[PDB]
Write a protein that binds this DNA or RNA. Sequence first.
DNA 1: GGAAGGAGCGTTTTTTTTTTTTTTT
DNA 2: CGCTCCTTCC
Lengths: 315, 327, 354, 232
Amino acid sequence: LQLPWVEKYRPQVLSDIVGNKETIDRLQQIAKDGNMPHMIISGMPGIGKTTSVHCLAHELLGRSYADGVLELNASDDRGIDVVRNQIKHFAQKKLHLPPGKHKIVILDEADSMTAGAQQALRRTMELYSNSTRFAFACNQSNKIIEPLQSRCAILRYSKLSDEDVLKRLLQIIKLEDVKYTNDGLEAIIFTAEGDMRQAINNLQSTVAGHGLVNADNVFKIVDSPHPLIVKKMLLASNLEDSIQILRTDLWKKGYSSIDIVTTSFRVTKNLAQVKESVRLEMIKEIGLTHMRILEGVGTYLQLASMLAKIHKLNN
Amino acid sequence: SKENLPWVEKYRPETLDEVYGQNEVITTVRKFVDEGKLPHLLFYGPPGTGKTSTIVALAREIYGKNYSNMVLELNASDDRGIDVVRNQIKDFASTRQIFSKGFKLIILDEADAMTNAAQNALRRVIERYTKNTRFCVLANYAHKLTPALLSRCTRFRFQPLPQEAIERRIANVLVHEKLKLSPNAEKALIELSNGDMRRVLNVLQSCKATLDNPDEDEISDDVIYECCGAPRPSDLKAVLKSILEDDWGTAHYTLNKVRSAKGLALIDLIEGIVKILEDYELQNEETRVHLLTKLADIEYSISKGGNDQIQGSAVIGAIKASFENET
Amino acid sequence: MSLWVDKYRPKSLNALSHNEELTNFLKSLSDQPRDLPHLLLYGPNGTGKKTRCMALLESIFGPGVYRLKIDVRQFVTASNRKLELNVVSSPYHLEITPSDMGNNDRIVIQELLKEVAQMEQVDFQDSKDGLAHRYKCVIINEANSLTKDAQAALRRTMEKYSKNIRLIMVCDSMSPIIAPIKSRCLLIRCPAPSDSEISTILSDVVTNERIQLETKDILKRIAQASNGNLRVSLLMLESMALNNELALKSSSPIIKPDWIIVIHKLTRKIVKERSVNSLIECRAVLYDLLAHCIPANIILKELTFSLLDVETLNTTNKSSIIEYSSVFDERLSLGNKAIFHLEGFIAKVMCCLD
Amino acid sequence: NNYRKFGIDYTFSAETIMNKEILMHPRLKRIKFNPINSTLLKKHLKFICVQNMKMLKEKNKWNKRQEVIDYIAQETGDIRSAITTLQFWATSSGSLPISTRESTISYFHAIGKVIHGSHSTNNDNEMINNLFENSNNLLSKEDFKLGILENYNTFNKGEFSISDASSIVDCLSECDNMNGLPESNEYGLREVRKTFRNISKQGHNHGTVYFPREWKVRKLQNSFKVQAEDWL
DNA sequence: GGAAGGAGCGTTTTTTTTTTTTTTT
DNA sequence: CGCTCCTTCC
Ligand SMILES: Nc1ncnc2c1ncn2[C@@H]1O[C@H](COP(=O)(O)OP(=O)(O)OP(O)(O)=S)[C@@H](O)[C@H]1O
Ligand SMILES: Nc1ncnc2c1ncn2[C@@H]1O[C@H](COP(=O)(O)OP(=O)(O)OP(O)(O)=S)[C@@H](O)[C@H]1O
Ligand SMILES: Nc1nc2c(ncn2[C@@H]2O[C@H](COP(=O)(O)OP(=O)(O)O)[C@@H](O)[C@H]2O)c(=O)[nH]1
Ligand SMILES: [Mg+2]
Ligand SMILES: [Mg+2]
């Protein structure tokens, strides 16, 4: 069959990863040099952490990749016994590698690892660092215990810029010979919200549905991120405007009340314009409405009353 | 066999052509299957919009009548802990097709009920076995899905059912049955449906029951209101007019009489009055603030029981006080 | 010997000496106990509700209802948290206080009571032919303190197995009782005795004990100090008689519960000073009161009414005080830790007074 | 995967690992260590940089060694982490933002941050957001609200208006009714911080903070229950 | 004889349901 | 994070 473009066009070399130019350049330097230290790679979903670690391991180990890499993720058994036996035996293995090259243990989604396993990892890292190096990949670097962080170089991946997403989208379009327009690519990038995976999925969906990637065609399938709609609803200077946004853009589109209130809390946490007193009062009202929704009264009237209270506070 | 089934199940769409209202999603998924490039799917929407029906119909179209042999369906009624993801889903996704029939399909219905650990374990299962397997996740509440899972799925939103699709399905059901529905009854049914087909079908079945001789008796709006025990628009209009114009004693008597005539519940009256007032043109906005806050408080109090008469008097007083601002 | 609260406790309906109408109603209930419905007795604490229930049971069965013994029943939670409950029993009835189980009270309803309801009580007939059946009587003390889950569990047990069991619940307030449970019960209001009847009972006790009383007025004062709690009246009468060489006089002090005096001192302190440090010391006093397992809502009532008894305060101050009391009583009902709400009430009162 | 709320699964420390009898045993001596101070860490970082003078000079990063050393010293007290960060920086020809391992703040440090604010950050919203993003485990525990309730009086040794104390306590009481939602904790902490910032002044002398005493009350209540059962 | 820097203190710990890991089995 | 005492450095 035909693979989805998200997996079909997964970068296979470090030079095809867009964004985080400084970090990717440093990874390329490490690959060409060899002296890879223990590292932690943190960042939001779909920005290239897994791809970056895999590409770096491949470039470092060459043909020895099969015998020199041990990959484990949240879908595998990773308990304390695994650390005691499998990882320990891999780190004990004597493998002849070119100078400056070490075995690599990739621990994808390391944040989910249990406390006992993480504590056990300390001793193996202490003992087998001369021949083995650890690459953790996670979304929250703080979920790795401090004794493990103390041994690793930290690398934080930032959200991808519109320029990098556009460049990769153009490369994919050229490879696939896809017909498009500037407004269509703008809409895809705007709906991706910095997630390259979502951008590729939306591009593929639009192409399959209609082929030509225009703004109207993109917005027929893809929806604008509802956090922005919630921000617009909260920032409306008129009660009727907020109510109209809540009705037309969220309620009648099938968005659940619980999702609306959770997104409202998340957005209100990041409103830079408002004062602290107003912000905390809005948070209180959102929390009370959330309590009411959890009890079973998830009605449009409750959300309208929440908006009315927020507007009252703004005055 | 099908005759004994409840209408909500007897009229479940079998093919994608029987799914109405979701034209964009159906179009896109049909073309994807036509080209055989199905990606990982997320179906997000409110109850009774056609998500489960659509996914089952798509599986039928892909695998014909033998879809039960190469589709792994799991829902909230099944345990789906991290152990289940690690063993059962993993083994199904990592094994060959029955007869090399392309890729396999795993349906995770009501996936918002899955634990965070299981969803985290699902990420690499989805990613690594994409060549051989495709995942479908159905949900009504997106906030229960981890960001990593959301990033991996192509998202499709099932909207509340438009009026035209509901009318078409009602016509189909009326033809299948020996039933006659009046235009006013159809309008009332659409209004009370709120975009959910299940409610439409259940109310239609109850209305057919209510008829003494369904072979010749026609369903009217009165039959619909009797079956649902809901207030009529005239009742709501009269109550609101009495509240906004008549004195306290007259308003109390009017509310009591209207409720006692057909045993109407206060919550439905409040909901109808709120619908009516949402379209009111108010020169003072503070009136809307008072109305919304007080009526929401009354609804929350009613949700826990309490004294019915006090709650009705509270509704009357709240509306009067709020509309004193317009003065 | 036994305390005078229990020593002179009436043991039959004819022995009741106050609220004659209630006695007549109970006797009417005992006329044909064959179809006795479930009962819910509500009224002020210490008025004689449990005494009246026991008198009703004695009327139905006989004096043997007062031959009580205690058993310990073990329950295991879903977390394997083993724990125990005290079950009082007489050959004709059972007595339980599931609220002592806290949030686990529901387990008691789901395991113990249901089983008791399911086991039909039959016995060989002494003279007639065939077995005889008799419904079991179960008393639920502190019914108002049950969690909503336990109250819900009570419903179908009461309805389905009505042939085998009849519940008699006792509470001091019906506000916390869910509507279905009230619907399933015959509600019996138990008024508190008047000052005259309390004084008569105390005078009878005094005569029985041969305690020299200078004047009957003392008894009246005792009544006025008990706020209608007959049990408290008898306890203070005994304490005062023992502390005065079994000779009461008009100058003899009235002994009140120590925590009540502490709350009065706290009220005086709050009135005198309104500052942050005063609030911290009030916190210390509140924590001392809570350490003795005094319920938070009881503390709030007593503090509120002690404050309302202050003569220097004006109408606005008292109105604000009662407003804050109502708000923080609701907050306590819906809260988890009582200290927050008690502190909030005291701080609001300090703000309104200052 | 844990979903457990025991002491050890929350904190890895001597108290949670050992017990009272072991720690208080007369034959066991306990010595507590502090993070390595800025002076020693700077000294050793300079020594390491000197030992690698040749490569640093060749790469043109020798002149900027003092800047990165000073930045590293103020960022962590972990010698191993500091050395690893220095090695990562020096071995890099390009420029990247130097970062060390994150360090959790203590209970009393969090209480002080809420009451008085943070010197580094002037925006209370940013401080609170960072506190909740990085110290969620500490803030979620109900003992934090009790600590705030029992320590807010330390501000100016309790020489502020009763109105502010009433506002803070009423806010905490309202938060106690929110079924432990995150919004409740956020609202409570924000209220406390805003109230104290509204009255912050240079001429203030603050008192000593203490752990909440609820545990003592619980022990006394348990003893009372035992005594009452005996009496019964 | 001015701070600047630093250390030490300010502490204790079950419970509802439900899910999960670990160890011995 | 704030307060209270012992160095450390010029
Ligand atoms: N910087 C990128 N450049 C090119 N493609 C990218 C990039 N980031 C993501 N993608 C694309 O999206 C797919 C997934 O990338 P990943 O490396 O798995 O993202 P991720 O950050 O590891 O997501 P998480 O943390 O596992 S949810 C890749 O196969 C690429 O096709
Ligand atoms: N688009 C639709 N077209 C025709 N019938 C529908 C449609 N949607 C729902 N129904 C009818 O309502 C019944 C339920 O449809 P479902 O597909 O199960 O809705 P749903 O969106 O999956 O509900 P949830 O999210 O699981 S509560 C079907 O058997 C159909 O008879
Ligand atoms: N002489 C006399 N004593 C009573 C009467 N009613 C109650 N008492 C006594 O006063 C006390 C009342 O406390 P109690 O029975 O526990 O009432 P409850 O707490 O409301 O259930 C008991 O010690 C009784 O012995 C009565 O009618 N006559
Ligand atoms: Mg990844
Ligand atoms: Mg479904």
